[PDB]
Short mmCIF file of C-alpha atoms in Angstrom, two decimals:
data_model
loop_
_atom_site.label_atom_id
_atom_site.label_comp_id
_atom_site.label_asym_id
_atom_site.label_seq_id
_atom_site.Cartn_x
_atom_site.Cartn_y
_atom_site.Cartn_z
CA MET A 1 1.62 2.84 -49.27
CA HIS A 2 1.55 -0.93 -49.29
CA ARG A 3 1.51 -0.96 -53.10
CA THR A 4 4.12 -3.14 -54.89
CA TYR A 5 6.81 -1.86 -57.21
CA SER A 6 4.66 -1.72 -60.32
CA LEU A 7 2.49 0.81 -62.16
CA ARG A 8 -0.67 -0.18 -60.28
CA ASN A 9 -1.90 1.08 -56.83
CA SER A 10 -2.28 -2.51 -55.80
CA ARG A 11 -1.16 -3.40 -52.29
CA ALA A 12 1.16 -6.42 -51.78
CA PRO A 13 -1.02 -9.32 -50.60
CA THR A 14 -0.29 -10.51 -47.11
CA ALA A 15 -0.41 -14.12 -45.92
CA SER A 16 -4.10 -13.74 -45.08
CA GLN A 17 -4.80 -12.67 -48.72
CA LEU A 18 -3.04 -15.77 -50.00
CA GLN A 19 -4.97 -17.93 -47.50
CA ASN A 20 -8.29 -16.42 -48.52
CA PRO A 21 -8.60 -14.30 -51.70
CA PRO A 22 -9.71 -10.71 -51.22
CA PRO A 23 -13.43 -10.10 -51.90
CA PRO A 24 -14.69 -7.92 -54.71
CA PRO A 25 -14.97 -4.15 -54.04
CA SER A 26 -18.09 -3.09 -52.25
CA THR A 27 -21.26 -2.16 -54.16
CA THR A 28 -22.18 0.52 -51.64
CA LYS A 29 -20.03 3.19 -53.41
CA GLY A 30 -22.59 5.96 -54.14
CA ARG A 31 -22.40 8.81 -56.49
CA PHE A 32 -21.70 11.47 -53.89
CA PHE A 33 -18.80 13.66 -52.56
CA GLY A 34 -18.38 11.35 -49.56
CA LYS A 35 -18.09 14.16 -47.07
CA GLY A 36 -21.66 14.27 -45.83
CA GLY A 37 -22.74 16.77 -48.40
CA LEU A 38 -22.47 20.57 -48.34
CA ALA A 39 -24.11 20.63 -44.88
CA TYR A 40 -21.27 18.60 -43.43
CA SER A 41 -18.61 20.30 -45.61
CA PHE A 42 -19.66 23.75 -44.32
CA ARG A 43 -17.58 23.11 -41.22
CA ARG A 44 -14.58 21.98 -43.38
CA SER A 45 -14.95 25.12 -45.47
CA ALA A 46 -15.17 27.36 -42.39
CA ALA A 47 -12.01 25.71 -41.10
CA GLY A 48 -10.17 27.26 -44.11
CA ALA A 49 -11.27 30.85 -43.47
CA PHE A 50 -10.15 34.05 -41.82
CA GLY A 51 -7.94 32.51 -39.08
CA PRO A 52 -4.46 33.25 -37.71
CA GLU A 53 -3.13 31.45 -40.83
CA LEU A 54 -0.96 29.29 -38.49
CA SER A 55 -3.47 27.09 -36.62
CA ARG A 56 -5.58 27.03 -39.78
CA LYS A 57 -4.26 23.58 -40.63
CA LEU A 58 -4.56 22.39 -37.01
CA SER A 59 -8.11 23.84 -36.66
CA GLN A 60 -9.08 22.07 -39.87
CA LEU A 61 -7.64 18.84 -38.50
CA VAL A 62 -9.64 19.34 -35.27
CA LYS A 63 -12.88 19.94 -37.20
CA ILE A 64 -12.19 16.96 -39.40
CA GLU A 65 -11.65 14.94 -36.28
CA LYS A 66 -15.04 16.22 -35.14
CA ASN A 67 -16.58 14.86 -38.30
CA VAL A 68 -14.81 11.57 -37.53
CA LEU A 69 -16.37 11.61 -34.09
CA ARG A 70 -19.82 12.39 -35.50
CA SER A 71 -19.63 9.66 -38.02
CA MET A 72 -18.45 7.15 -35.38
CA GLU A 73 -21.34 8.21 -33.17
CA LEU A 74 -23.69 7.62 -36.09
CA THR A 75 -22.32 4.13 -36.67
CA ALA A 76 -22.31 3.18 -32.94
CA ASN A 77 -25.92 3.98 -32.02
CA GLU A 78 -27.27 2.64 -35.34
CA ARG A 79 -25.10 -0.49 -34.90
CA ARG A 80 -26.66 -1.12 -31.60
CA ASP A 81 -29.98 -0.60 -33.32
CA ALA A 82 -28.85 -3.23 -35.80
CA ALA A 83 -28.14 -5.62 -32.92
CA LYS A 84 -31.63 -4.98 -31.37
CA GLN A 85 -33.14 -5.65 -34.82
CA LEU A 86 -31.20 -8.86 -35.05
CA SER A 87 -32.57 -10.03 -31.78
CA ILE A 88 -36.05 -9.06 -32.84
CA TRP A 89 -35.62 -11.09 -36.05
CA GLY A 90 -34.32 -14.07 -34.14
CA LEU A 91 -37.25 -13.97 -31.80
CA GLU A 92 -39.31 -16.21 -34.12
CA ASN A 93 -36.84 -18.93 -35.11
CA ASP A 94 -35.36 -22.25 -33.88
CA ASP A 95 -34.55 -22.33 -30.20
CA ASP A 96 -30.79 -22.85 -30.81
CA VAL A 97 -30.94 -20.17 -33.49
CA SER A 98 -32.82 -17.74 -31.23
CA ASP A 99 -30.36 -18.34 -28.40
CA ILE A 100 -27.29 -17.97 -30.55
CA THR A 101 -28.54 -14.84 -32.37
CA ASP A 102 -29.46 -13.22 -29.05
CA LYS A 103 -25.94 -13.95 -27.76
CA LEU A 104 -24.52 -12.43 -30.96
CA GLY A 105 -26.78 -9.43 -30.42
CA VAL A 106 -25.47 -8.97 -26.93
CA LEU A 107 -21.97 -9.28 -28.19
CA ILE A 108 -22.67 -6.61 -30.75
CA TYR A 109 -24.11 -4.44 -27.97
CA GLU A 110 -20.83 -4.88 -26.06
CA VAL A 111 -19.12 -3.82 -29.29
CA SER A 112 -21.22 -0.67 -29.48
CA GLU A 113 -20.59 0.14 -25.81
CA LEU A 114 -16.77 -0.16 -26.39
CA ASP A 115 -17.20 1.96 -29.48
CA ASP A 116 -18.81 4.66 -27.27
CA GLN A 117 -15.98 4.50 -24.82
CA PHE A 118 -13.47 4.75 -27.71
CA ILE A 119 -15.53 7.81 -28.81
CA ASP A 120 -15.09 9.40 -25.36
CA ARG A 121 -11.35 8.77 -25.47
CA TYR A 122 -11.38 10.12 -29.02
CA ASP A 123 -12.98 13.28 -27.62
CA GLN A 124 -10.17 13.46 -25.08
CA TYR A 125 -7.70 13.31 -28.00
CA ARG A 126 -9.61 16.00 -29.86
CA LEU A 127 -9.69 18.22 -26.83
CA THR A 128 -5.94 17.97 -26.33
CA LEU A 129 -5.55 18.91 -30.01
CA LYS A 130 -8.02 21.80 -29.46
CA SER A 131 -5.74 22.99 -26.65
CA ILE A 132 -2.62 22.80 -28.82
CA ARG A 133 -4.47 24.58 -31.66
CA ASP A 134 -5.55 27.42 -29.31
CA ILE A 135 -2.08 27.92 -27.86
CA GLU A 136 -0.61 27.99 -31.33
CA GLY A 137 -3.26 30.48 -32.44
CA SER A 138 -2.49 32.64 -29.48
CA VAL A 139 1.24 32.56 -30.21
CA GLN A 140 0.88 33.34 -33.88
CA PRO A 141 0.15 37.17 -33.42
CA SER A 142 3.61 37.61 -31.84
CA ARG A 143 5.28 36.49 -35.10
CA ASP A 144 2.72 38.42 -37.13
CA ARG A 145 3.54 41.63 -35.24
CA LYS A 146 7.30 40.75 -35.65
CA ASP A 147 6.84 40.54 -39.43
CA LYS A 148 4.92 43.78 -39.58
CA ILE A 149 7.46 45.59 -37.49
CA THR A 150 10.48 44.37 -39.51
CA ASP A 151 8.71 45.33 -42.74
CA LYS A 152 7.92 48.78 -41.41
CA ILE A 153 11.46 49.38 -40.08
CA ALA A 154 12.88 48.22 -43.44
CA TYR A 155 10.67 50.86 -45.18
CA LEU A 156 11.64 53.48 -42.70
CA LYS A 157 15.33 52.67 -43.18
CA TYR A 158 14.59 53.03 -46.98
CA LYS A 159 13.16 56.53 -46.28
CA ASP A 160 16.07 57.88 -44.22
CA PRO A 161 18.90 56.60 -41.93
CA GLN A 162 18.23 58.84 -38.91
CA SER A 163 14.49 58.95 -38.10
CA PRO A 164 13.97 58.62 -34.37
CA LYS A 165 10.98 56.42 -35.11
CA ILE A 166 13.54 53.99 -36.73
CA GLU A 167 15.61 53.61 -33.54
CA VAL A 168 12.53 53.41 -31.42
CA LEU A 169 11.07 50.55 -33.48
CA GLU A 170 14.48 48.78 -33.49
CA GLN A 171 14.46 49.05 -29.70
CA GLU A 172 10.96 47.61 -29.54
CA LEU A 173 11.90 44.95 -32.12
CA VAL A 174 14.81 43.68 -30.03
CA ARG A 175 12.23 43.17 -27.27
CA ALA A 176 9.81 41.55 -29.67
CA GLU A 177 12.50 39.20 -30.90
CA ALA A 178 13.30 38.09 -27.35
CA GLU A 179 9.63 37.56 -26.52
CA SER A 180 9.04 35.66 -29.72
CA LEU A 181 12.11 33.48 -29.07
CA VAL A 182 10.61 32.62 -25.62
CA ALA A 183 7.11 32.15 -27.13
CA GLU A 184 8.51 29.78 -29.78
CA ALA A 185 10.54 27.76 -27.31
CA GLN A 186 7.49 27.29 -25.12
CA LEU A 187 5.37 26.73 -28.15
CA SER A 188 7.70 23.88 -29.28
CA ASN A 189 7.75 22.41 -25.78
CA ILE A 190 3.97 22.48 -25.37
CA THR A 191 3.45 21.15 -28.89
CA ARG A 192 5.81 18.28 -28.33
CA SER A 193 4.30 17.44 -24.94
CA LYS A 194 0.67 17.60 -26.02
CA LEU A 195 1.45 15.68 -29.25
CA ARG A 196 3.31 12.89 -27.46
CA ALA A 197 0.71 12.62 -24.64
CA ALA A 198 -2.36 12.85 -26.81
CA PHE A 199 -1.22 10.38 -29.40
CA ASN A 200 0.17 7.89 -26.88
CA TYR A 201 -3.09 8.01 -25.06
CA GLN A 202 -4.93 7.74 -28.41
CA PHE A 203 -2.88 4.63 -29.39
CA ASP A 204 -3.32 3.10 -25.99
CA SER A 205 -7.02 3.66 -26.22
CA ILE A 206 -7.28 2.16 -29.69
CA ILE A 207 -5.16 -0.88 -28.93
CA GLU A 208 -7.18 -1.49 -25.77
CA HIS A 209 -10.50 -1.21 -27.55
CA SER A 210 -9.32 -3.26 -30.49
CA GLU A 211 -7.78 -6.08 -28.52
CA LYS A 212 -10.87 -6.09 -26.32
CA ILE A 213 -13.19 -6.38 -29.38
CA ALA A 214 -10.88 -9.09 -30.75
CA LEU A 215 -11.16 -11.00 -27.43
CA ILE A 216 -14.87 -10.58 -27.90
CA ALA A 217 -14.77 -11.85 -31.47
CA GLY A 218 -12.80 -14.94 -30.41
CA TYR A 219 -15.37 -15.71 -27.74
CA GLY A 220 -18.14 -15.29 -30.30
CA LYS A 221 -16.33 -17.74 -32.66
CA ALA A 222 -16.12 -20.25 -29.86
CA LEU A 223 -19.75 -19.68 -29.08
CA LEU A 224 -20.79 -20.20 -32.67
CA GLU A 225 -19.70 -23.92 -32.35
CA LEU A 226 -22.88 -24.58 -30.23
CA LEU A 227 -25.32 -24.70 -33.16
CA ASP A 228 -25.27 -27.69 -35.48
CA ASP A 229 -24.68 -27.03 -39.13
CA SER A 230 -25.63 -30.64 -40.18
CA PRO A 231 -28.66 -30.44 -42.56
CA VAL A 232 -31.86 -32.16 -41.55
CA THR A 233 -33.99 -34.22 -43.95
CA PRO A 234 -37.53 -33.13 -44.41
CA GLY A 235 -40.02 -34.82 -42.15
CA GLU A 236 -38.62 -35.68 -38.70
CA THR A 237 -37.23 -32.94 -36.47
CA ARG A 238 -33.74 -32.88 -35.03
CA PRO A 239 -33.30 -33.34 -31.22
CA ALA A 240 -33.99 -30.23 -29.13
CA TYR A 241 -31.13 -27.91 -28.24
CA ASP A 242 -30.16 -28.18 -24.58
CA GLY A 243 -26.91 -26.15 -24.73
CA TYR A 244 -28.38 -23.18 -22.84
CA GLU A 245 -25.98 -23.86 -19.89
CA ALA A 246 -22.96 -23.97 -22.22
CA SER A 247 -23.90 -20.72 -23.90
CA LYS A 248 -24.47 -19.06 -20.49
CA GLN A 249 -21.16 -20.37 -19.24
CA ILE A 250 -19.43 -18.96 -22.35
CA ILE A 251 -20.97 -15.55 -21.81
CA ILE A 252 -20.06 -15.66 -18.15
CA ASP A 253 -16.41 -16.46 -18.91
CA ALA A 254 -16.48 -13.71 -21.56
CA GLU A 255 -17.68 -11.25 -18.89
CA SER A 256 -15.10 -12.47 -16.46
CA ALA A 257 -12.27 -12.03 -18.95
CA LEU A 258 -13.69 -8.67 -19.92
CA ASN A 259 -13.69 -7.41 -16.31
CA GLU A 260 -10.25 -8.99 -15.66
CA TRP A 261 -8.72 -7.27 -18.71
CA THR A 262 -6.00 -4.82 -17.87
CA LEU A 263 -3.12 -3.08 -19.55
CA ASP A 264 -0.70 -5.49 -17.82
CA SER A 265 -2.62 -8.42 -19.29
CA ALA A 266 -2.09 -7.16 -22.92
CA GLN A 267 -1.46 -10.42 -24.62
CA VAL A 268 -0.83 -8.52 -27.96
CA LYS A 269 2.93 -8.20 -28.40
CA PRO A 270 4.92 -6.45 -31.12
CA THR A 271 8.21 -7.68 -32.39
CA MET B 1 16.17 76.51 -0.67
CA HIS B 2 18.78 79.08 0.52
CA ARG B 3 16.35 80.29 3.17
CA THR B 4 17.70 80.46 6.71
CA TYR B 5 16.25 78.64 9.68
CA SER B 6 13.48 81.06 10.36
CA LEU B 7 9.83 81.45 9.65
CA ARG B 8 10.48 83.62 6.49
CA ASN B 9 11.38 82.53 2.95
CA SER B 10 14.39 84.78 3.05
CA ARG B 11 17.60 83.43 1.60
CA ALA B 12 20.80 83.72 3.64
CA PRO B 13 22.79 86.79 2.32
CA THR B 14 26.09 85.87 0.72
CA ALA B 15 29.24 87.88 0.93
CA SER B 16 28.11 89.93 -2.13
CA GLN B 17 24.90 90.82 -0.32
CA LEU B 18 26.90 92.06 2.66
CA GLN B 19 29.18 94.04 0.30
CA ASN B 20 26.30 95.65 -1.48
CA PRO B 21 22.75 95.46 -0.13
CA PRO B 22 20.12 93.77 -2.29
CA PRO B 23 17.99 96.08 -4.42
CA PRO B 24 14.19 96.39 -3.85
CA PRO B 25 12.01 93.94 -5.66
CA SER B 26 11.27 94.77 -9.32
CA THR B 27 8.29 96.95 -10.21
CA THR B 28 7.67 94.98 -13.41
CA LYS B 29 5.44 92.41 -11.64
CA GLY B 30 2.27 92.49 -13.67
CA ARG B 31 -1.24 91.26 -12.78
CA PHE B 32 -1.06 88.13 -14.96
CA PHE B 33 -0.70 84.36 -14.72
CA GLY B 34 2.95 84.60 -15.77
CA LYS B 35 2.69 81.67 -18.20
CA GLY B 36 2.11 83.70 -21.49
CA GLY B 37 -1.64 83.60 -21.10
CA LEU B 38 -4.07 80.95 -22.19
CA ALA B 39 -2.60 80.90 -25.65
CA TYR B 40 0.82 79.83 -24.32
CA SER B 41 -0.80 77.67 -21.58
CA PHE B 42 -2.73 75.65 -24.25
CA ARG B 43 0.42 73.62 -24.93
CA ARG B 44 0.90 73.04 -21.13
CA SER B 45 -2.74 71.86 -20.89
CA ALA B 46 -2.38 69.65 -23.92
CA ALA B 47 0.68 68.06 -22.30
CA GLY B 48 -1.60 66.87 -19.49
CA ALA B 49 -4.00 65.02 -21.74
CA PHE B 50 -4.75 61.55 -23.21
CA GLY B 51 -1.29 60.16 -23.22
CA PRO B 52 0.45 56.94 -22.18
CA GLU B 53 0.22 58.24 -18.58
CA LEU B 54 3.90 57.40 -18.13
CA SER B 55 5.64 59.90 -20.44
CA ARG B 56 2.92 62.45 -19.48
CA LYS B 57 5.25 64.16 -17.03
CA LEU B 58 8.19 63.90 -19.40
CA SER B 59 6.19 65.26 -22.33
CA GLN B 60 5.00 68.04 -20.09
CA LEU B 61 8.62 68.80 -19.16
CA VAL B 62 9.63 68.81 -22.85
CA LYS B 63 6.84 71.21 -23.82
CA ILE B 64 7.75 73.43 -20.83
CA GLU B 65 11.31 73.38 -22.11
CA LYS B 66 9.97 74.43 -25.46
CA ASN B 67 8.27 77.40 -23.78
CA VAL B 68 11.65 78.15 -22.10
CA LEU B 69 13.20 78.15 -25.58
CA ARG B 70 10.58 80.37 -27.05
CA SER B 71 10.94 82.90 -24.24
CA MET B 72 14.74 82.88 -24.65
CA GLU B 73 14.33 83.35 -28.37
CA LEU B 74 12.08 86.28 -27.60
CA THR B 75 14.64 87.91 -25.20
CA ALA B 76 17.61 87.29 -27.55
CA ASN B 77 16.33 88.85 -30.79
CA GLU B 78 14.70 91.74 -28.82
CA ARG B 79 17.85 92.25 -26.76
CA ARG B 80 19.88 92.60 -29.93
CA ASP B 81 17.13 95.13 -31.00
CA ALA B 82 17.84 96.89 -27.68
CA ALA B 83 21.59 97.03 -28.56
CA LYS B 84 20.76 98.48 -31.98
CA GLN B 85 18.46 101.09 -30.33
CA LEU B 86 21.24 101.98 -27.91
CA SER B 87 23.72 102.52 -30.72
CA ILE B 88 21.07 104.70 -32.55
CA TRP B 89 20.59 106.74 -29.33
CA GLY B 90 24.34 107.14 -28.84
CA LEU B 91 24.67 108.39 -32.52
CA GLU B 92 24.01 111.97 -31.43
CA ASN B 93 26.14 112.42 -28.31
CA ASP B 94 29.68 113.14 -27.24
CA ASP B 95 32.49 111.48 -29.25
CA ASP B 96 33.72 109.44 -26.26
CA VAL B 97 30.14 108.71 -25.30
CA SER B 98 29.25 107.67 -28.82
CA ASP B 99 32.25 105.35 -29.21
CA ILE B 100 31.85 103.81 -25.78
CA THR B 101 28.10 103.21 -26.32
CA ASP B 102 28.73 101.70 -29.68
CA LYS B 103 31.27 99.33 -28.14
CA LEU B 104 28.76 98.41 -25.39
CA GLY B 105 26.21 97.79 -28.21
CA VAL B 106 28.56 95.52 -30.08
CA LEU B 107 29.25 93.67 -26.73
CA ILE B 108 25.49 93.20 -26.27
CA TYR B 109 25.30 91.93 -29.81
CA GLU B 110 27.95 89.39 -28.94
CA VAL B 111 25.83 88.52 -25.90
CA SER B 112 22.79 87.97 -28.05
CA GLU B 113 24.78 85.75 -30.52
CA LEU B 114 26.06 83.67 -27.58
CA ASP B 115 22.46 83.45 -26.37
CA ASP B 116 21.41 82.11 -29.78
CA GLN B 117 24.12 79.47 -29.67
CA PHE B 118 23.02 78.50 -26.16
CA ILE B 119 19.47 78.24 -27.61
CA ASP B 120 20.69 75.84 -30.26
CA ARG B 121 22.44 73.73 -27.60
CA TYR B 122 19.25 73.97 -25.51
CA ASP B 123 17.30 72.54 -28.49
CA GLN B 124 19.85 69.72 -28.61
CA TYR B 125 19.03 69.07 -24.92
CA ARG B 126 15.27 69.22 -25.65
CA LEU B 127 15.67 66.79 -28.55
CA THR B 128 17.51 64.32 -26.34
CA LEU B 129 14.71 64.62 -23.86
CA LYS B 130 12.21 64.13 -26.66
CA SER B 131 14.01 60.97 -27.59
CA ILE B 132 13.88 59.62 -24.05
CA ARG B 133 10.15 60.69 -23.75
CA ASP B 134 9.31 58.78 -26.97
CA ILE B 135 11.15 55.59 -26.03
CA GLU B 136 9.46 55.72 -22.59
CA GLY B 137 6.06 56.21 -24.24
CA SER B 138 6.76 53.29 -26.59
CA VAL B 139 7.71 51.05 -23.69
CA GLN B 140 4.66 51.95 -21.57
CA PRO B 141 2.09 49.87 -23.52
CA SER B 142 4.04 46.71 -22.60
CA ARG B 143 3.34 47.25 -18.87
CA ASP B 144 -0.14 48.45 -19.71
CA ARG B 145 -0.88 45.08 -21.47
CA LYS B 146 0.79 43.29 -18.58
CA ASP B 147 -1.58 45.00 -16.04
CA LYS B 148 -4.59 44.27 -18.22
CA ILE B 149 -3.55 40.61 -18.66
CA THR B 150 -2.95 40.07 -14.95
CA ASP B 151 -6.30 41.66 -14.05
CA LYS B 152 -8.13 39.46 -16.61
CA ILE B 153 -6.40 36.25 -15.44
CA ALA B 154 -7.21 37.10 -11.87
CA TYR B 155 -10.91 37.46 -12.76
CA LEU B 156 -10.82 34.24 -14.80
CA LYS B 157 -9.19 32.47 -11.79
CA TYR B 158 -12.06 33.84 -9.76
CA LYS B 159 -14.58 32.39 -12.20
CA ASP B 160 -13.17 28.86 -12.23
CA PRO B 161 -9.82 27.02 -11.65
CA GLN B 162 -9.69 25.05 -14.89
CA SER B 163 -10.60 27.17 -17.83
CA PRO B 164 -8.22 26.52 -20.82
CA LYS B 165 -8.26 30.27 -21.43
CA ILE B 166 -6.65 30.72 -17.96
CA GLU B 167 -3.70 28.50 -18.78
CA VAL B 168 -3.30 30.07 -22.26
CA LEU B 169 -3.13 33.57 -20.75
CA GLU B 170 -0.80 32.42 -18.10
CA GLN B 171 1.55 31.03 -20.76
CA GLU B 172 1.28 34.30 -22.67
CA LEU B 173 1.81 36.27 -19.45
CA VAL B 174 5.07 34.42 -18.65
CA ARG B 175 6.27 35.62 -22.07
CA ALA B 176 4.98 39.15 -21.45
CA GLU B 177 6.78 39.22 -18.03
CA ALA B 178 10.09 38.31 -19.69
CA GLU B 179 9.64 40.80 -22.48
CA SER B 180 8.66 43.49 -19.98
CA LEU B 181 11.77 42.74 -17.85
CA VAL B 182 13.91 43.15 -20.94
CA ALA B 183 12.05 46.24 -21.95
CA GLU B 184 12.44 47.79 -18.47
CA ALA B 185 16.13 46.89 -18.31
CA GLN B 186 16.81 48.59 -21.62
CA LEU B 187 14.52 51.46 -20.65
CA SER B 188 16.53 52.01 -17.47
CA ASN B 189 19.79 51.78 -19.47
CA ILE B 190 18.59 54.24 -22.23
CA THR B 191 17.11 56.66 -19.65
CA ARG B 192 20.31 56.75 -17.66
CA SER B 193 22.51 57.21 -20.72
CA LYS B 194 20.32 59.92 -22.32
CA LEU B 195 19.90 61.68 -18.99
CA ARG B 196 23.63 61.71 -18.17
CA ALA B 197 24.72 62.66 -21.70
CA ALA B 198 22.08 65.36 -22.25
CA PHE B 199 22.52 66.99 -18.84
CA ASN B 200 26.33 66.81 -19.02
CA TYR B 201 26.17 68.44 -22.46
CA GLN B 202 23.67 71.01 -21.12
CA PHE B 203 25.83 71.95 -18.16
CA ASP B 204 28.91 72.13 -20.31
CA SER B 205 27.03 74.43 -22.73
CA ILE B 206 25.74 76.65 -19.90
CA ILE B 207 29.12 76.94 -18.20
CA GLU B 208 30.81 77.77 -21.53
CA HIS B 209 28.27 80.36 -22.49
CA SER B 210 28.22 81.83 -18.95
CA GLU B 211 31.99 81.97 -18.48
CA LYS B 212 32.25 83.42 -22.03
CA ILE B 213 29.65 86.15 -21.25
CA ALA B 214 31.49 86.91 -18.00
CA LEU B 215 34.79 87.18 -19.87
CA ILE B 216 32.89 89.70 -22.11
CA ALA B 217 31.59 91.61 -19.07
CA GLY B 218 35.09 91.92 -17.63
CA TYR B 219 36.35 93.29 -20.95
CA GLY B 220 33.49 95.70 -21.01
CA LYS B 221 34.29 96.78 -17.47
CA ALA B 222 37.81 97.44 -18.49
CA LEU B 223 36.64 99.32 -21.53
CA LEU B 224 34.38 101.60 -19.44
CA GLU B 225 37.49 103.12 -17.90
CA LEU B 226 38.14 105.06 -21.07
CA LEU B 227 35.49 107.67 -20.59
CA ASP B 228 36.15 110.41 -17.99
CA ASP B 229 33.53 110.79 -15.24
CA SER B 230 35.01 114.08 -13.99
CA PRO B 231 32.32 116.74 -14.28
CA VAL B 232 33.07 119.75 -16.53
CA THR B 233 32.12 123.33 -15.56
CA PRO B 234 29.73 125.21 -17.79
CA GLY B 235 31.50 127.20 -20.41
CA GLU B 236 34.78 125.78 -21.75
CA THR B 237 34.80 122.38 -23.32
CA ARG B 238 36.87 119.39 -22.07
CA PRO B 239 39.73 118.16 -24.36
CA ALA B 240 38.74 115.95 -27.23
CA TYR B 241 38.68 112.22 -26.78
CA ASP B 242 41.53 110.52 -28.71
CA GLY B 243 41.18 107.08 -27.10
CA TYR B 244 39.86 105.48 -30.29
CA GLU B 245 43.06 103.35 -30.64
CA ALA B 246 42.75 102.09 -27.03
CA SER B 247 39.17 101.08 -27.51
CA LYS B 248 39.94 99.28 -30.77
CA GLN B 249 42.87 97.52 -29.10
CA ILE B 250 40.56 96.45 -26.29
CA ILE B 251 37.98 95.06 -28.64
CA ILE B 252 40.69 93.33 -30.70
CA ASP B 253 42.02 91.69 -27.57
CA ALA B 254 38.50 90.70 -26.58
CA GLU B 255 38.00 89.10 -30.01
CA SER B 256 41.37 87.32 -29.69
CA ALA B 257 40.49 85.91 -26.30
CA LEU B 258 37.05 84.93 -27.59
CA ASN B 259 38.51 82.97 -30.50
CA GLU B 260 41.18 81.51 -28.28
CA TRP B 261 38.68 80.30 -25.66
CA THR B 262 38.45 76.53 -25.37
CA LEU B 263 37.17 73.96 -22.84
CA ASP B 264 40.84 73.35 -21.82
CA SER B 265 41.26 77.04 -21.07
CA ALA B 266 38.37 77.04 -18.62
CA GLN B 267 39.73 79.33 -15.89
CA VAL B 268 36.58 78.70 -13.81
CA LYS B 269 37.43 76.10 -11.14
CA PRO B 270 35.28 74.44 -8.49
CA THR B 271 36.48 73.42 -5.14
#
């Protein structure tokens, strides 16, 4: 949607893009459907199946959100595995390198834990959407019966103008219309309420998790200053790294700001 | 209901009973069920069968009314047969006797025709009751579903206090309650309207037919004065009967009053 007014689907570069040019496209693009294969697309296909034809789209969205959740669960546990592997690799290295890589590993572990909490809040969002899907599916048969009744009464009117069955189904249809009006009014109310609440909670969760992980990334950037990037000539060895206390103080302050973080202290501000 | 305040089911004698004592009970009481046998009771039994349990009584009443109609049809055609047989018997008799019995036969034929018209109006009454029975039967499943839903939601509340299914069925039950309120309001309205109209028409039909047949009976009583009841001694023969013109004038006046009869000219008056 950010594409410029040209013939190319090229997004307009932001100030960050001008500051640092965008990198080349990733080489990880594999020759695959990109939906987890037929095994993971079985759920997607089953979403588009014999349903109430009304919550079909909503049920499909819910099951797609379940796929989202499964993928995020896959990238959280295996990311914390990556952090563990990074610490294991940094075990046998320079003392400053080992300390700094262990601190980066623990920061990534914090990242994975926040991802898991975001996953739980995502499941709350998905459960609210499941509730709205189920109430919509329960309210659909009312309108289905309404459509069937109006079609049958139209056919009966075609057959003759004085069948008692005609008047009886008209009398039942005036009841069905009122019940369907009430059902659709409450359906609109519940859909609006669930939609607003679920998406407000979802956006609050994502902004909280994202600003928290950004607060973590800033602390990690500050921590990365401890190691010295000055190259050392072959032969003599550089002085030993004694910044253990500084790194521990940095991680302590990061923990303190992490625990102190609250919705009131949301330094992110729109304009 | 007219029984006196005693231990016997003996009705209080009216002024007619004092004027002429009641006759002995009829000897036509046969040793039978009195419902036309099992063949004619098959319909009555089928009325009390797998129905909506609400219009069961009304459907039974309708089918009983059908039995009423069939019996009345049996006694109308066969009564006109009796009138024909009476004329055939009076064929070979005295001239005055033959004329008077032919006039009584034609009066009974008029009676049978009025009975047939009353039967048609009775069928109108029965059709209105069929309509009310059918709308009541169509409205019963609403309350049946209401009862089933409230029982199921009570059981689900017993199981747990937070099942989503519980809230969904409560939301559908608040719709079902409103639709059932509307259905019962229109059911009461239609029942009152059909009941009042059908029974007012039925009572107007019965009073019209009855006062007409009474107007016929009075004319027949006046006509019976033509024949002479004075006994004749054996031997000589009484003078010939020349009252053909008087009888024809009586029947002409009866026809004129029959055609002139209208609801406005209803000389029967309550007090």
